[PDB]
Amino acid sequence: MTDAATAPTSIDLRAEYEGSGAKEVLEELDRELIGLKPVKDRIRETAALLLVERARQKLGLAHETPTLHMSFTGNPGTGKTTVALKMAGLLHRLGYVRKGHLVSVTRDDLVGQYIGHTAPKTKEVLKRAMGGVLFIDEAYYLYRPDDYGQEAIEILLQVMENNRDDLVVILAGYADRMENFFQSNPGFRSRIAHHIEFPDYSDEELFEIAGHMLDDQNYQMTPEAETALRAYIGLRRNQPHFANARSIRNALDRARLRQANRLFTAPLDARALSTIAEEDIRASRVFKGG
Amino acid sequence: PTSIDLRAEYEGSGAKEVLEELDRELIGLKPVKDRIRETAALLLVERARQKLGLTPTLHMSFTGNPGTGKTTVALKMAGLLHRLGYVRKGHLVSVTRDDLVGQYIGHTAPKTKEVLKRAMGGVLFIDEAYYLYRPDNERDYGQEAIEILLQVMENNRDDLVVILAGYADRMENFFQSNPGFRSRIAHHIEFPDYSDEELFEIAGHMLDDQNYQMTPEAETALRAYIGLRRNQPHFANARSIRNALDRARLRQANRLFTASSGPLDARALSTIAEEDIRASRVFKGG
């Protein structure tokens, strides 16, 4: 009876990081996410673990696969899906998951209407998702004890413990709703390896964004419109279902529509056409509360 | 040219003539019609801006229930867009998911592409577009149609406008799963239902056209009915009304046949009673 190890004695982490194409994925994430340090930094921290646990496996110290599903909580427009894209990428380059693909999904894709229809629907989605990552947006809507989503949850749960080298799940949505979900459904908390919290952009950053949005479309703002917009951002951001940069485009979109109707209703040069007056923003229902 | 008269373009385009055409050809849904009036204004201004040196961005989404004017507004849009020089041949190509995705493995990309060829110079109108994304099904090749669609909406711009339409809950989910559409749709138009009073007017006209009258009690019974029906799934406005009246008529016929006091006259046979409407499972909960 003998026992011999046939695994490298040492491993350079920086060498693996670089050569596994792991480094680059994080760099892509840098390019593909308009400055959101806290989350980018959080992902790096996650990436160091994935890299170490890979290194441990290569030295022959691994016992099972690490648990490596995760939960992205936050407001819309905060970078979740595009991070999940990168998470799929990084997990692929680190050989944690077979094929680097992401399968984005919502309640409807898993929960059928007529009785019995749920089980094969989830399973089929799961099949397409094996090899890569399954991203379930607002996963908490599966559980509505108010529709047999209960079964999707169970097939989902079973899968998450059992066969780990096939699939990775990233649950996503608002934090409070996700927390209640976890409260109402034990067993997920055990399985989730990582909670990544996605914060909003600052008033300053959203104003930056709005600024660029206008410039591209050659649109100038009056100072009273600059005031109004700032006010707007401040109010909108504490109102339900805040969609960061998206709800800024929508707001500017709505201001662009009002501005167009204002003029047309009242000959005009390029300045009069490209200018957005205070009324166009102030006319929003964000100021009246709604 | 240095300034631009907007009314000159508005009157020169015939854009007003299409907006009139919309009022005349859509039983009053002033809410929507104003939203289209407003979009017309912006479309006008944007054009006047493009004519002073400042590619547009045109695609839109139409969300709401069956029977809110999505198709008949989309047709007028194609008109309006052709009148404001955004589109070359102002014609609307209306398609479902079953016109873009083929069963066979690879017989989808030529099919989407050819449909698109027919769409060029006008508007493609994808009804219930979210049905292109079916990862629920295996052997449905709808993701390729999405890819080709998405690529077209960014790249090959100045010769096509796309309108995705259908239920809003299902559309917003479709954007979650397939992002890059939100940024490509510049116009989100919500199509709300008819107001209760309007639905009731419709019900009334339908019954006049058929020579049936309601008893006052039954009228209030319908008003109750309508309010409930609009909160249940798949409300189809006018269709749901025809459907209720059809079932009411069926119930009225059976009420009368089963009573059989003896002979009965035109009023008895033309009247829909409270029983005929209230017997609906819409009042039970479904």
Swiss-Prot record, chain A:
GO MF terms held by the record: ATP binding; ATP hydrolysis activity
Xref: InterPro entries: AAA+_ATPase, AAA_lid_6, ATPase_AAA_core, CbxX/CfqX_mono, CbxX/CfxQ, CbxX/CfxQ_RuBisCO_ESX, P-loop_NTPase
Effect of N250D: Abolishes ATPase and activase activities
Binding site for ATP: G74, N75, P76, G77, T78, G79, K80, T81
Listed result of changing E138Q: Abolishes ATPase and activase activities
Result, substituting A48N: Reduces ATPase and activase activities 8-fold
Entries under Pfam families matching the protein: AAA, AAA_lid_6
SMART domains (alphabetical): AAA
Record keywords, A-Z: ATP-binding, Nucleotide-binding
Signal peptide: none
Role: ATPase involved in the activation of red-type RuBisCo (ribulose-1,5-bisphosphate carboxylase/oxygenase), which tends to form inactive complexes with its substrate ribulose 1,5-bisphosphate (RuBP). Catalyzes the release of RuBP from inhibited RuBisCo in an ATP-dependent manner. Activation of RuBisCO involves the ATP-dependent carboxylation of the epsilon-amino group of lysine leading to a carbamate structure.
Assembly description: Forms homohexameric rings. The oligomeric transition is triggered by ribulose 1,5-biphosphate.
Family statement: Belongs to the CbxX/CfxQ family.
Name of this protein: Protein CbbX
Annotated gene: cbbX
UniProtKB/Swiss-Prot annotation, chain B:
UniProt cross-references to SMART domains, sorted A to Z: AAA
Classification via SUPFAM superfamilies: P-loop containing nucleoside triphosphate hydrolases (SSF52540)
Result when mutating E128Q: Abolishes ATPase and activase activities
Classification via InterPro entries: AAA+_ATPase, AAA_lid_6, ATPase_AAA_core, CbxX/CfqX_mono, CbxX/CfxQ, CbxX/CfxQ_RuBisCO_ESX, P-loop_NTPase
Segments crossing the lipid bilayer: none
Keyword entries, A-Z: ATP-binding, Nucleotide-binding
Binding site for ATP: G64, N65, P66, G67, T68, G69, K70, T71
Sample GO molecular function, one term: ATP hydrolysis activity
Substitution effect: R251A: Abolishes ATPase and activase activities
Source species, domain of life: Bacteria
Effect of Y104A: Increases ATPase activity and abolishes activase activity
Effect upon mutating R247A: Abolishes ATPase and activase activities
Annotated function: ATPase involved in the activation of red-type RuBisCo (ribulose-1,5-bisphosphate carboxylase/oxygenase), which tends to form inactive complexes with its substrate ribulose 1,5-bisphosphate (RuBP). Catalyzes the release of RuBP from inhibited RuBisCo in an ATP-dependent manner. Activation of RuBisCO involves the ATP-dependent carboxylation of the epsilon-amino group of lysine leading to a carbamate structure.
Self-association state and partner proteins as the record states: Forms homohexameric rings. The oligomeric transition is triggered by ribulose 1,5-biphosphate.
Family according to the record: Belongs to the CbxX/CfxQ family.
UniProt protein name: Protein CbbX
Native organism taxonomy: Bacteria, Pseudomonadati, Pseudomonadota, Alphaproteobacteria, Rhodobacterales
Gene name, Swiss-Prot/TrEMBL: cbbX
